[PDB]
């Protein structure tokens, strides 16, 4: 029976995982979720199928921009109250960058609400030096739960406008 145990090295498992994750990045295969209305929150994401920890949930897609245009567009959204704040900063290697999702499209990572006791977290994914911000489940999630994460704004002035800490 030539019994030869199959043991993937710790050099192919992450390789077989990086390409198993990025195949939802360059593609828009955003399955397993639905759009719903949540009281006080408006549009939100509901999981229609079971999610385990480490399972990819949804990519936060948008225009990848620099900080110099970032600040100008942030001022623009500050001037117009009805535009909203869909923009989201991050850091990569030795430089800061950002993603703009204010333009209303079919991308569904932008429509996710906020919670400090949520079930998902945002992580970076590098593809040929291109960052992509992906929301991934932090724990086992059954179908029907609302997808939530931490907006990463524990600022004094941000809480003044949007004081939804918990519950």
């Amino acid at each position: 029976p030539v019994r030869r145990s199959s043991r993937k090295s710790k050099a192919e498992l992450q390789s077989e995982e990086r390409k198993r994750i990025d195949e939802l990045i360059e593609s828009g295969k955003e399955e397993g979720m639905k759009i719903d209305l949540i009281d006080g929150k408006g549009r939100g994401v509901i999981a229609t199928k079971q999610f385990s920890r480490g399972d990819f949930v949804v990519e936060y897609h948008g225009d990848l921009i620099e900080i110099t245009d970032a600040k100008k567009r942030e001022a623009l959204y500050a001037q117009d109250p009805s535009t909203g704040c869909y923009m989201y900063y991050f850091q990569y290697l030795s430089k800061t960058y950002c993603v703009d999702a204010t333009r209303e499209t079919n991308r569904l990572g932008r429509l996710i609400n906020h919670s400090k006791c949520g079930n998902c977290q945002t992580k970076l994914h590098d593809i040929d030096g291109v960052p992509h911000l992906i929301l991934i489940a932090s724990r086992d999630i059954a179908a029907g739960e609302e997808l939530l994460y931490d907006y990463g704004d524990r600022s004094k002035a941000s809480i003044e406008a949007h004081p939804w800490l918990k519950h």
Binding site: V2, R3, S5, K10
Partner: protein, 96 residues
């Protein structure tokens, strides 16, 4: 007469015939494999003894043999060795 030494020669040879039926092993390589088996046995058993002493347990069970295996061997080796050990202990229990 006498001069009897305990070794893992035949067992390493049998597992070799299972994994590579058409190949053999030299005396020096068999000695190295025996030394490897002795070293790993001593390492895992010492870690299991330390585990038992830490938790004030005077018995080495399968649980701290498993814990010692997880402590010593790196990641994927630890997972697959734990799988094999649990499979073997299940088969042994299902044949009392």
């Amino acid at each position: 007469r006498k001069t009897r030494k305990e070794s893992y020669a035949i067992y390493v040879y049998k597992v070799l015939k299972q994994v590579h039926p058409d190949t053999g092993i030299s005396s020096k390589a068999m000695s190295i494999m025996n030394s490897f088996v002795n070293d790993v046995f001593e390492r895992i058993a010492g870690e299991a003894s330390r585990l038992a002493h830490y938790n004030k347990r005077s018995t080495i069970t399968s649980r701290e043999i498993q814990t010692a295996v997880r402590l010593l061997l790196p990641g994927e080796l630890a997972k697959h060795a734990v799988s094999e050990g649990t499979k073997a202990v299940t088969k042994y229990t299902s044949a009392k």
